[PDB]
Structure formats: C-alpha cells, structure tokens
Amino acid sequence: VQVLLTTIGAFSAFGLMTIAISTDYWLYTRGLTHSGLWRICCLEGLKRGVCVKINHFAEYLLRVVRASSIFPILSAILLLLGGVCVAASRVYKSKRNIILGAGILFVAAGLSNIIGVIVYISANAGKNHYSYGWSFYFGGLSFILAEVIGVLAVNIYIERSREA
Amino acid sequence: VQVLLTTIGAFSAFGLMTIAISTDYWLYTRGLTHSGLWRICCLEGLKRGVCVKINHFAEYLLRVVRASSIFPILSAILLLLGGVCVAASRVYKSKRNIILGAGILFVAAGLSNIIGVIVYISANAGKNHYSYGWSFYFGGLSFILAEVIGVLAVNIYIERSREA
Amino acid sequence: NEFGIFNSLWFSLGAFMQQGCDISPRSLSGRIVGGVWWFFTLI
Amino acid sequence: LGISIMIKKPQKSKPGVFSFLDPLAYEIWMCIVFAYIGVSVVLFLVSRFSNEFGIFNSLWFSLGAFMQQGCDISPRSLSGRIVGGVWWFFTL
Amino acid sequence: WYDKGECGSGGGDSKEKTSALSLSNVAGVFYILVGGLGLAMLVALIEFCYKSR
Amino acid sequence: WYDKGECGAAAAASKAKTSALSLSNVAGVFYILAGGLGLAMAVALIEFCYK
Amino acid sequence: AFTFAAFCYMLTLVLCASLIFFVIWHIIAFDELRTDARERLKNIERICCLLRKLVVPEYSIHGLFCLMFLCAAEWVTLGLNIPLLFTHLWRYFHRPADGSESIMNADILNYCQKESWCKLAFYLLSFFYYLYSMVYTLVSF
Amino acid sequence: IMIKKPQKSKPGVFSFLDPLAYEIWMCIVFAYIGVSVVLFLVSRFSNEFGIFNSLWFSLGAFMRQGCDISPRSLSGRIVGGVWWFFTLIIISSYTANLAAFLTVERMVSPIESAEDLSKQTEIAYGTLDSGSTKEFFR
Amino acid sequence: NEFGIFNSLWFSLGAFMRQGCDISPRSLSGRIVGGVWWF
Ligand SMILES: O=c1[nH]c2cc(C(F)(F)F)c(N3CCOCC3)cc2n(CP(=O)(O)O)c1=O
Ligand SMILES: Oc1nc2ccc(-c3c(Cl)cccc3OC(F)(F)F)cc2[nH]1
Ligand SMILES: Oc1nc2ccc(-c3c(Cl)cccc3OC(F)(F)F)cc2[nH]1
Ligand SMILES: CCCCCCCCCCCCCC
Ligand SMILES: CCCCCCCCCCCC
Numbered sequence: 001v002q003v004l005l006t007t008i009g010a011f012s013a014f015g016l017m018t019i020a021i022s023t024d025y026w027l028y029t030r031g032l033t034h035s036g037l038w039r040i041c042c043l044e045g046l047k048r049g050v051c052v053k054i055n056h057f058a059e060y061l062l063r064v065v066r067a068s069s070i071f072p073i074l075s076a077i078l079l080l081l082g083g084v085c086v087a088a089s090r091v092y093k094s095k096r097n098i099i100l101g102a103g104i105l106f107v108a109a110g111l112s113n114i115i116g117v118i119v120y121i122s123a124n125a126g127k128n129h130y131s132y133g134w135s136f137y138f139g140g141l142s143f144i145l146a147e148v149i150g151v152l153a154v155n156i157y158i159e160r161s162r163e164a
Numbered sequence: 165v166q167v168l169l170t171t172i173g174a175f176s177a178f179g180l181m182t183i184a185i186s187t188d189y190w191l192y193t194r195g196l197t198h199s200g201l202w203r204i205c206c207l208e209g210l211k212r213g214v215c216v217k218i219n220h221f222a223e224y225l226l227r228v229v230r231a232s233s234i235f236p237i238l239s240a241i242l243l244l245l246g247g248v249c250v251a252a253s254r255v256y257k258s259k260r261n262i263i264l265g266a267g268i269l270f271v272a273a274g275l276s277n278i279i280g281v282i283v284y285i286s287a288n289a290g291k292n293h294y295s296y297g298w299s300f301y302f303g304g305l306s307f308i309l310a311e312v313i314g315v316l317a318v319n320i321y322i323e324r325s326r327e328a
Numbered sequence: 329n330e331f332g333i334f335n336s337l338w339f340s341l342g343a344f345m346q347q348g349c350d351i352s353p354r355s356l357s358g359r360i361v362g363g364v365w366w367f368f369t370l371i
Numbered sequence: 372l373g374i375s376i377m378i379k380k381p382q383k384s385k386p387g388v389f390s391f392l393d394p395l396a397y398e399i400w401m402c403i404v405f406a407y408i409g410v411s412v413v414l415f416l417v418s419r420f421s422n423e424f425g426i427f428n429s430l431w432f433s434l435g436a437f438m439q440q441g442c443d444i445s446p447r448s449l450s451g452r453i454v455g456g457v458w459w460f461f462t463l
Numbered sequence: 464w465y466d467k468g469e470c471g472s473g474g475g476d477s478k479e480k481t482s483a484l485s486l487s488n489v490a491g492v493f494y495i496l497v498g499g500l501g502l503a504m505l506v507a508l509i510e511f512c513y514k515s516r
Numbered sequence: 517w518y519d520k521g522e523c524g525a526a527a528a529a530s531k532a533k534t535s536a537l538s539l540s541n542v543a544g545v546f547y548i549l550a551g552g553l554g555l556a557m558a559v560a561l562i563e564f565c566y567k
Numbered sequence: 568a569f570t571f572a573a574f575c576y577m578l579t580l581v582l583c584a585s586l587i588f589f590v591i592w593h594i595i596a597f598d599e600l601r602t603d604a605r606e607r608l609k610n611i612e613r614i615c616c617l618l619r620k621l622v623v624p625e626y627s628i629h630g631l632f633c634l635m636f637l638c639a640a641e642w643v644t645l646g647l648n649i650p651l652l653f654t655h656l657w658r659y660f661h662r663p664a665d666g667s668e669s670i671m672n673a674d675i676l677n678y679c680q681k682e683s684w685c686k687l688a689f690y691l692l693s694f695f696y697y698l699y700s701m702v703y704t705l706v707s708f
Numbered sequence: 709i710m711i712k713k714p715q716k717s718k719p720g721v722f723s724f725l726d727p728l729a730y731e732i733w734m735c736i737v738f739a740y741i742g743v744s745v746v747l748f749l750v751s752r753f754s755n756e757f758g759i760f761n762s763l764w765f766s767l768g769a770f771m772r773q774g775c776d777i778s779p780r781s782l783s784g785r786i787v788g789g790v791w792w793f794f795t796l797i798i799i800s801s802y803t804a805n806l807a808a809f810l811t812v813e814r815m816v817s818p819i820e821s822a823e824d825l826s827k828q829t830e831i832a833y834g835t836l837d838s839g840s841t842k843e844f845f846r
Numbered sequence: 847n848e849f850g851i852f853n854s855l856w857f858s859l860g861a862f863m864r865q866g867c868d869i870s871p872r873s874l875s876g877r878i879v880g881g882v883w884w885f
C-alpha cells in the first residue's frame with residue numbers, strides 16, 4: 001500500500017540521482033558547449049563529439065568540493081541506504097526502527113542534495129547567457145522525490161508504532 | 165475621592181489651556197523675538213516692549229485655521245464644558261450619564277488640542293534656529309491633564325454603573 | 329473586558345512597534361482605532 | 372542653423388510583467404522554494420518522533436514564517452525551535 | 464557671458480544634502496489618525512444609543 | 517518640416533513622467549493574487565462537492 | 568496595458584463564479600422544496616432559514632460590482648448592472664415577511680422559480696461579458 | 709521664454725502616498741475588499757471567518773501586524789498565502805520607492821515651450837509694454 | 847506566567863526576527879523589558 005510506494009520512490013530517486021551526476025548535460029553555455037559535472041563537451045564548432053574534463057585550478061574549499069562533487073555523491077549513497085533499509089524492513093519485520101532509519105536517510109539525502117546544488121551554482125559563475133539541461137532537472141526531481149518518500153516513511157513508522 | 169480629583173484636573177487643565185493661547189511666549193526666533201499665537205513681540209533690538217500682530221497673508225485652509233486658532237479655542241471650550249458637567253453631576257445626582265458626557269468632553273479636548281499643535285507646527289515652518297517657550301509647554305501639559313482626567317471620569321462612570 | 333487602561337497602553341505600544349500582542353479589539357468602534365493606528369505606524 | 376547632435380530616440384522601455392522579482396536572481400527565487408520544502412519536511416520529521424504539526428500544518432507554518440506574518444501555532448520542543456529560529460533568520 | 468558668469472552649473476550640479484523629515488511631510492497622516500479616532504468615538508456612541516433602545 | 521511630417525507630432529506636448537511606481541510596474545503580483553483567488557474558489561468548490 | 572478597469576474586470580470575473588453558485592443552490596432548494604407531519608414543517612423551516620441567510624451575500628456582492636465599476640469609470644457596464652441592483656433593492660418585493668416565505672406553496676413559488684432562472688441566465692451572460700471585457704482590455708496591449 | 713528656476717515646493721498634505729501611483733492605491737483598496745469577500749465565501753462553503761471578522765484579518769495581514777486567527781481549511785489557506793505574498797511585495801515596493809524619492813531629487817520645468825505655454829493658461833506670461841515683442845505678437 | 851528560560855529565549859528571538867510572538871508578558875516589569883526590546 002505505502003511500503004511499496006516508498007520502495008519505488010527510493011529506487012526511482014536513486015536512479016535519477018545516479019543518472020544526474022554521471023551524465024554531462026547540466027549547463028549549456030558558450031561555440032555552444034553542453035557542459036556537465038565532470039566533463040565539458042563541445043557542440044557546433046571546429047571540434048565536436050569527444051570532449052575533455054574540467055579544470056579546477058579559503059575559496060579553495062569551494063573549488064575542491066565542487067570538483068570532487070561530494071554532496072550529490074553522498075545524496076546518492078543515502079538514497080541507496082534508505083532503499084536497502086526499507087527493503088530490510090519487509091524481512092525481519094516488526095523492527096519498528098528500521099523504517100524510521102529509512103525516514104531519516106531519505107531526508108538527509110534531500111539536505112545533501114540541496115547543498116550540492118547551492119555549491120554547484122555558486123561555483124558555476126566563477127554578459128554571456130547560459131541555461132540548464134536535463135541532468136540538472138533530474139537532480140531537482142530527485143530532491144522532490146526524496147523528500148516525499150521521507151515523509152511517507154515517517155508516516156508508515158508512526159502508523160506502525162500506534163498500531164502497537 | 166475621585167470626583168474631586170476630576171474637578172481639580174478639569175479646572176487646572178482649563179486654566180492652563182486658556183493661559184497658553186492668550187499669552188505670547190510660544191516660539192523664540194530671530195533680533196530675538198518671543199513670538200506667540202496671536203502677537204509677535206521683539207526683544208534685544210532697536211524696538212522692544214510693545215509689539216505687533218501676526219500677518220497671515222488649498223493651503224489657504226491651513227493659513228486660516230492657524231490664524232483663527234480655532235482648535236486650541238475649542239479645546240478650552242470642551243474642557244470648560246467637561247468641568248461644568250462634572251460640577252452638575254454632584255447636584256442632581258444619580259444621572260449616570262452626565263459623568264460619561266464629561267468623560268467624552270475631556271477626551272475630545274485632547275484630540276482638538278493635538279490637531280491644534282499639529283497645525284501650529286505645520287504652519288510655523290512656512291538655517292535659522294528656533295525654540296519653544298512656556299506657553300507651548302502649558303499647552304502640552306494641558307493635553308496630558310485632559311487625557312488623564314478623561315480616563316478618571318470613565319472609571320468613575322463604570323464604578324457607579326456597576327454599583328447599580 | 330480585557331482592554332483596561334493598562335492593557336490598552338500595552339496593545340497600542342505593541343501595535344506601533346509592529347510586533348502585535350495577544351489581545352485584539354473585537355468591536356467595530358474598537359477596530360477602527362486599531363486600523364487607523366496600524367496605518368499610521370506603517371507609514 | 373548650426374552643427375547639432377543626433378541620437379537614437381529612447382524607447383518607452385515597458386517593464387516586464389513579472390519585473391517585481393528582478394532584485395533577486397532566478398536561482399535565489401527557486402532555491403527559496405526548495406529550501407522551504409526542505410524545512411517543512413524536516414520540521415515534520417522532528418515534531419513527529421514517538422501534536423498539531425502534521426505535514427500540511429507544517430507547510431502552513433513554514434509558509435507563514437517566510438512571509439514575516441507568523442501563524443497561531445509555534446514549535447514547542449527544542450529541536451523544532453532550532454528549525455524555526457534558523458528559518459526565521461534566513462527569511463529575515 | 465559664461466566666463467564672466469556669477470554662477471556655474473557644474474559646481475552645484477549635484478550638491479546633494481539630505482534633511483530630516485519635518486512634520487510638514489508627515490502631518491497628512493496625523494490628520495488621518497485623529498480623524499479615525501473621532502470617527503471611532505462617533506460610531507461607538509451611535510451603537511450605544513441604538514442598543515439602549 | 518512639421519505639417520507634412522511622416523512620423524507626425526503625436527504626443528508633441530510633453531507629459532511630465534512621474535517617478536511614482538505605475539500599475540504597469542507591479543502588475544505581476546496582481547495577476548498572481550487574482551489567480552490565487554480563482555484557484556481557492558476551485559478548491560473550495562471541490563471540497564464541498566466531495567461531501 | 569494593465570489598468571484599474573482591467574483589474575476590476577478580473578476581480579468581477581472571480582466573484583461571478585460565486586454569484587452563479589448562489590443562484591444554482593437557490594434553484595436546487597426551490598426544486599427540493601416544491602416537490603412534497605412535523606418533520607415536513609422542520610424541513611421547510613430549515614430551507615427557509617437557509618434561503619434567508621443566502622439572500623444577503625448575493626446582493627452585497629453585486630453591490631460591490633456596481634461600486635467597483637462606478638469608482639473605476641466604466642459606464643457601459645454600470646448601466647447594465649443598475650437594473651438588477653434596483654430589483655435587488657426589493658422594488659418588486661412586498662412587505663410581508665423578512666424571509667422569502669407560511670409554506671407559501673402557491674403562485675409565489677412559481678414566481679420565485681421563474682425569477683431565479685432569469686437571474687441565473689443574467690449572471691452567466693454577465694460573466695461571459697466580463698471575461699470578454701477583461702481579455703479585450705489586457706490583450707489590446 | 710524666461711521662467712523662475714524650478715525649486716522644490718513645500719511638501720503638501722497627503723504627500724505620504726506619493727511613492728505609489730493613484731491607480732495602485734485604488735487597486736490595493738479593491739484587492740483588499742476582494743480578498744476578504746473571497747475568504748468569507750470560502751470559509752462559509754465548507755469557522756469564525758464572517759465578513760466582519762475576515763476584513764479584520766485581511767487588514768491585519770496587510771499592515772504587518774500579527775493576525776489574531778488563521779485559516780484552517782486548504783482553500784482558506786491558499787487565499788491567506790497569496791495575500792501575504794501580495795502585501796509583502798507592495799510594502800517593499802513602497803519603502804524602496806520612497807527611499808528613491810528621498811535620495812536623489814529630480815526637478816522638472818513646469819513649462820517646456822510656448823506651444824504648451826499657450827495650452828496651459830494657468831501660468832501668466834507677459835511681454836514688455838511696447839516694442840519689437842508686442843508688435844510681433846499683434 | 848510561564849516565561850522560563852527556555853521559553854523566554856524563544857520569545858526574545860521571535861520578537862527580534864519580526865515574527866509574531868506566541869505569548870506576551872502580563873506584569874509591569876515584564877512589559878517594560880518587552881517594550882524596550884521591541885524598540
Ligand atoms: O533695434 C533695436 N535693438 C534692440 C536691442 C536690444 C538689446 F539687444 F537687448 F540690446 C533691445 N532690448 C531688449 C530687452 O533688453 C534690453 C533692450 C531692444 C532693441 N530695440 C527695441 P525693441 O523693438 O523692443 O526690440 C530695437 O529697436
Ligand atoms: O541535484 C539537484 N538539486 C536541485 C535543486 C533544484 C533544482 C532546480 C530545478 Cl528542479 C528547477 C529550477 C532551478 C533549480 O535549481 C535552483 F537551485 F533551484 F535554481 C535542480 C536540482 N538538481
Ligand atoms: O497645546 C499643546 N499641545 C501640545 C502637544 C505637545 C507639546 C510638546 C511638548 Cl509638551 C513637549 C515637546 C514637544 C511638544 O510638541 C510636539 F508636538 F510634541 F513636538 C506641546 C503642546 N501644546
Ligand atoms: C538564528 C541563529 C542564527 C545563527 C547564525 C550564526 C552565524 C555565524 C557566522 C560566523 C561567520 C564569521 C566569519 C568571520
Ligand atoms: C573521475 C571519476 C568518476 C567517478 C564517478 C563515480 C560516481 C558514480 C555514482 C556513484 C554513486 C554510487
């Protein structure tokens with residue numbers, strides 16, 4: 001009823017947040033270059049197709065955190081852990097605390113995600129016009145899905161704790 | 165106990181607000197001229213002592229209202245009416261509404277007074293430095309005394325209406 | 329009711345500092361005063 | 372006659388329909404929405420460990436808190452008051 | 464005409480100075496405040512007289 | 517010069533442009549408000565038809 | 568070309584949905600009332616009280632419409648809205664009881680049915696006219 | 709054409725409503741009266757939000773003073789939220805434009821050319837007694 | 847009146863951030879502090 005919805009949300013959110021970082025269509029900017037989180041690629045120019053990485057050289061903390069894009073990576077990790085915790089609640093049932101653990105993981109995922117995008121957009125601007133692709137909006141949709149499945153996980157935990 | 169305090173307040177306030185307008189020591193400005201509400205007088209100059217009136221010629225409404233200083237005159241009238249109403253409550257007692265009438269007169273006095281000073285200060289400025297005398301502060305003290313005796317009159321009315 | 333003289337001074341002071349209190353007027357003639365004093369303090 | 376200047380005529384320059392939100396960039400106007408959803412979910416989380424702070428009620432409180440208005444309800448526990456205080460400072 | 468000029472445009476071009484808001488600027492709201500108070504007392508008496516009968 | 521001017525002398529008399537905010541400048545928030553009331557009415561009818 | 572008259576047009580457009588729903592509920596109430604011990608008296612009393620409470624907002628809101636048009640200077644529309652304001656001022660209404668109804672299950676019931684249908688038709692026509700005026704004033708920019 | 713140098717006038721009564729145009733003030737008044745009516749209708753479909761007690765809530769929310777009560781339904785809360793946003797934007801706009809008025813002052817000549825000086829006719833304009841100017845005008 | 851330390855800190859912080867106060871002091875000496883901090 002709701003545990004299945006939480007599972008499908010958990011793995012959909014993890015899928016979207018592991019497609020967001022790996023692929024490179026985040027930022028469109030200028031020839032037109034469809035950028036990414038790790039790799040920048042060129043379009044409509046002398047060169048095309050194959051493409052090159054980003055160069056990232058106490059503003060050093062921003063540079064290193066943006067470079068080693070830790071916060072989206074951690075968001076993906078947390079979503080995966082929440083997914084496995086919800087999976088492990090079905091077996092070994094009546095633990096009463098694994099589901100709350102899932103409810104916290106799916107929310108810490110949202111917080112790490114929003115730090116990830118604040119850092120990315122802060123480092124990006126470091127006149128010309130730019131635009132955002134579909135990797136960016138997969139990230140943004142993963143945040144929403146993570147928060148919603150978090151509230152559903154807490155709802156399930158409260159219902160199952162009141163049933164006892 | 166409190167009716168006597170209201171009477172002494174009523175006539176003290178009326179005395180102060182009829183001394184404020186008649187006398188002329190409101191505004192000190194430049195030779196130094198101790199001004200007034202009706203008459204301006206000179207000090208420390210070629211002329212002294214005897215003195216002359218003010219000349220007051222839709223800003224015309226401000227000029228005429230400031231000239232014919234109606235609002236302080238009406239404040240004095242209202243304070244006098246409140247005083248006679250409180251006096252007439254002692255005789256013909258148990259009217260139960262003369263005291264409330266006094267409580268309203270002593271407050272409309274405050275409102276007309278504050279309009280009087282807003283108008284006076286607004287018209288005054290129509291650089292050089294100025295200052296305010298003791299007629300001005302008698303007016304200001306009359307306002308305070310009027311509001312306080314108004315609240316005392318309503319208090320008396322409420323007590324005497326609850327006693328019935 | 330609750331709007332004695334002290335409560336009234338407290339409400340009016342609160343209304344000037346744009347903080348607002350727990351008591352509010354509940355009659356028409358007590359709400360006109362509140363509305364006008366609110367507008368004045370806003371300006 | 373004489374030698375005289377000649378410049379392009381200044382246009383009317385009609386303001387945009389949604390020009391009231393220029394003073395803040397678009398990224399700010401959307402991270403505000405995303406932080407609002409985040410806060411409304413965290414306040415629910417913290418209040419609901421085991422009152423009036425359901426999820427809809429929590430979204431209402433956090434909306435009210437952003438617009439400087441403030442609601443009838445207010446968090447009454449330490450770990451809800453921290454969220455309230457930080458969101459208050461941010462919106463200020 | 465300009466070199467033998469009593470005044471120059473550039474010197475006083477900005478010359479900006481700011482002054483405290485005098486009561487003249489604001490008094491338009493003091494009038495409204497006292498008008499509202501008078502109106503409130505008036506409607507209070509009207510309601511009182513209507514409810515007494 | 518003037519009586520045969522192609523561009524003409526439309527609004528030849530100068531109009532003193534006031535520096536106060538015009539309604540065309542904050543029209544967005546008015547559109548939002550009226551839309552919000554329309555949506556509130558839709559939701560309030562849905563709730564009543566629900567019961 | 569946002570203008571005060573245009574904003575009054577949109578606001579009237581929003582309120583006219585409510586102004587229609589009132590008359591639809593009045594139609595339903597009449598139909599549920601006409602088709603008929605103490606339970607009947609209680610039912611008719613409840614319907615009468617409901618109608619008495621529902622009457623006033625339907626008039627006050629139209630008062631707002633005409634007032635907004637007067638203050639915004641749109642006379643071609645204020646002229647259309649005046650006749651209903653006058654009828655809403657109990658011009659044809661007699662002085663018998665404060666409420667619309669004594670069961671009053673007579674020709675008065677048919678009269679109120681007919682005038683309610685007429686009022687609904689007028690409301691919907693005015694709604695579409697308001698929508699057209701709004702679109703005309705805005706899109707003309 | 710010779711005119712006196714335009715200098716700042718005495719600030720008139722009712723000057724406090726200069727930072728916003730007249731049309732905006734009227735739209736504010738009727739928006740407040742529209743929001744209160746809609747809030748009343750919403751709280752009386754589906755609850756002490758009578759018309760008198762809802763006009764007070766809307767006015768309290770505009771003047772930034774705290775609200776006594778708050779809507780509980782969804783459809784009341786939508787109205788509450790959008791009117792809160794509206795008031796926030798309008799008050800910020802008023803304060804900012806007033807600051808602009810006070811910071812940099814901009815003086816405008818009442819009359820620009822004789823083509824408009826003829827149309828004005830509220831300003832008296834005069835020549836010398838007799839000479840080239842008067843003979844030219846006759 | 848409750849106004850313990852934990853609740854008084856919340857009242858002061860609420861009054862600073864312009865967000866409406868949950869409760870208000872009732873005594874006189876509790877009201878002078880409120881008025882001064884509001885100013
Ligand atoms: O031949 C003429 N040459 C003129 C030259 C002048 C000036 F240029 F200013 F010296 C003037 N003035 C205009 C006003 O300022 C002072 C005197 C008048 C002249 N007049 C009389 P008009 O008919 O009134 O023009 C003549 O006849
Ligand atoms: O991992 C990710 N987290 C995200 C959070 C928000 C957005 C986003 C969206 Cl969805 C639409 C428009 C602007 C956006 O970014 C913003 F910061 F809001 F400007 C994208 C994200 N991707
Ligand atoms: O008839 C009168 N009404 C009055 C109201 C106030 C004052 C006053 C005082 Cl008492 C002290 C300092 C400034 C004052 O004038 C102010 F307007 F406040 F600036 C004087 C008054 N006289
Ligand atoms: C409501 C409480 C908010 C607390 C915010 C604390 C801000 C700390 C910033 C310190 C930065 C110092 C840089 C030199
Ligand atoms: C430059 C090395 C690339 C590293 C990218 C690995 C991260 C992919 C997603 C991992 C989430 C589990």
Ligand SMILES: CCCCCCCCCCCC
Pocket residue numbers: 182185186202237240241
């Ligand atoms: C120049 C005319 C003098 C008018 C002064 C008479 C007012 C004195 C106080 C009246 C209050 C009763």
Ligand SMILES: CCCCCCCC
Pocket residue numbers: 147148151152155408412426
């Ligand atoms: C109870 C499910 C939650 C739906 C909306 C939550 C948005 C954060």
Ligand SMILES: CCCCCCCC
Pocket residue numbers: 311312315316319333
């Ligand atoms: C009960 C007497 C009142 C004392 C203070 C009133 C100040 C307006």
